[PDB]
């Protein structure tokens, strides 16, 4: 009703218009980014706007010659956005290594999207638990810096990197402050509103996004809550960026109070540590971040992260949203499910294609709510 | 009609016996206090070899492939994994392996033998998840080597450092997990034998460039497998040398695997293991498969030769490079493995496209049959871009959908009809070419 989050909703709906106008105002380049491990500080320091590729959740046939249909809907939907010309304003494309399926989106995009002027693949270590991974990633981040300096012909100094890191860390801290409100019994921020904020963080200028988050937080102390909370849900998955689906969940008698997904907490959760070598601060922030399943071995540190979030936000039920064919999350799913259930959190499993009729999922959510109402 | 002389391989029985002995040794490892470990065929098995000559692996994918050849047992294993709760679209080898562990049945008889530890390479996402479940169910230590440092051609000092330093951690891990002291001499011998076996497998594959091909791919599946069992063993290296001598003699005598050879085909990844009869069917057309990047380089290690051709990689000691200490051996061992051709498409599918185009040229291939393998994300990533690159090149190329480990996603009838249509296509193209050049 009060429209507090409308700016984030507009930014999401009009993301492409925003990027084009950003180029007019700043004269900078736009870079299509893939996977949340992209070291965006480096792109910001180089004067560029990082915009995360996401899907459109509409029917598409353009990817069949490029990606075999055994691979997930997200990697195909994402590639379709490039092939359809919807990122034609982006001079660059970059991916930082995680899931192997996503690497196909990057490979096919750099080969076939005719507006790409440059590309870069960052082989971030997967084994962030190794004592050698932070040194390796330090050198990867430095190498990307050298690449960007060469590409733009402008020195990217430590001061420039430190200013970009400050902007990113402020965004991460502000998003965490926003999330704090979701711990209340009657949250002043819905899960949908939190999602608009955390997703747009990934494709709006961070300086502009931080200003909007600061306005949002200035308004929350006195914001009036009219809706009833209903059941306290957690959403768990890879990306989880279908806001329309989340809106259905919150309309049937529930609130999504926390999440484990790259549209949300897994993107922003930790700020960097205070540290004088800015390359180390940047590289280690990503290594220390809650891990993608692909990067979570030998220990399943994710299980403790997810359960800790569930307890801190007083979750009553956890909903696994899984992309069809998603190997990293499929590999973790049976035992993550058991871990939550053994700790008193009932779970629900839902699987998604590029598009999905909402009717069947709502029936499942309503049946899940009836189960919570009994024990 | 039979234009070429043909002969069965003399070392066939030995190839089969070495593989059977490998599986029996894993099961019997404890009778004399041996060590057992498990991990991928891509694990760096010279590291556990530093712990003794009685260190026996079970490599996960070749074991699962052996199970997949027994359709009934593979179905039972997959059903057990599904009962635990795993998605049926996960890697079919991993599901098979998991199921057989829960059923507690070994394909070669007896209980499923418990490994002492997991020693794994991680490049495919499923590489960790496979053994995380195993290590939890068996309650054993687990070590993973992250080899994800990007294409070999782009390698830096720091990337190689990352892999080498992890290998030093792996040495410490296997010492602690086993209770034994690592022996540099045994380790270095194992590095050298792995270099020998993987380069020599490539040398053997390179002999298949001649007409007639001395080996057919179905036969090769019983030969490339040895390096997937224990590439760092003396037995595997020595057998590769012996096999090379036999295949050289076949070339010298004009011996064809397929006496009516008229068509040379190339395949790609992971054939459906309970349907290898498709190869024999193609032989009736005079079609021989000369191999694939998979058969040649799942373990084979290659280099560019002085004439530009592809052949086995030069052993360091034939290049004046000494290997006389642990640290030197670790870094050379890391570098050797990072050059594996079948790791490169995990980063850049065009590297594999170019490798496939090169095989088509150097092995004189007439047509390409690509398996769109729903059972293996790791070897299937990029496959459609590879198909496109072959299609643009002018070489005939077809696809068929399947799953190497799960027959429920392989349609025998449709696939055979697609392959028969492809043989017709190759005949039509030959008629047109003849008619145009008179
Ligand atoms: C055992 C097998 C499955 C089947 O074998 P066979 O079909 O040969 O059956 P058989 O019952 O044993 O013998 C009957 C046959 O012997 C023939 N013959 C007789 N005398 C012969 C002679 N003197 N010379 C030549 N041939 C001779 C007869 O003609 C007859 O054949 P026929 O009926 O058609 O006429 C075999 O293909 C094999 O080992 N595959 C490897 C599986 C595997 O482990 N792969 C590694 C996976 S690792 C991996 O994927 C990854 C790793 C890492 C990362 C990701 C992936
Ligand atoms: S999907 Fe393929 S590459 Fe990955 S674990 Fe399975 S057999 Fe190995």
Residue numbers in the entry:
A (entry chain B): 2 to 376
B (entry chain A): 5 to 442
Study text:
An alternative to the classical Birch reduction is provided by dearomatizing benzoyl-coenzyme A (BzCoA) reductases (BCRs) from anaerobic bacteria. BCRs reduce their substrate to cyclohexa-1,5-diene-1-carbonyl-CoA (dienoyl-CoA), representing an ortho- rather than the para-dihydro addition of classical Birch reductions. Architecturally, the heterotetrameric enzyme complexes are composed of two functional dimers: the ATP-binding dimer coordinates a subunit-bridging [4Fe-4S] cluster and serves as an ATP-dependent electron activator, whereas the catalytic dimer is predicted to contain an FeS cluster in each subunit and the substrate binding site. In this study, we heterologously produced the active site components BzdNO from Aromatoleum sp. CIB and provide a first X-ray structural characterization of the catalytic dimer of a class I BCR with the BzCoA substrate and the dienoyl-CoA product in van der Waals contact with the catalytic FeS cluster.
The structure of BzdNO in complex with the product dienoyl-CoA reveals the identical binding mode as the substrate in the BzdNO-BzCoA complex. The dearomatized ring of dienoyl-CoA remains nearly planar; only the C4 sits slightly outside the plane. Instead, it catalyzed the reverse reaction, the methyl viologen-dependent rearomatization of dienoyl-CoA to BzCoA.
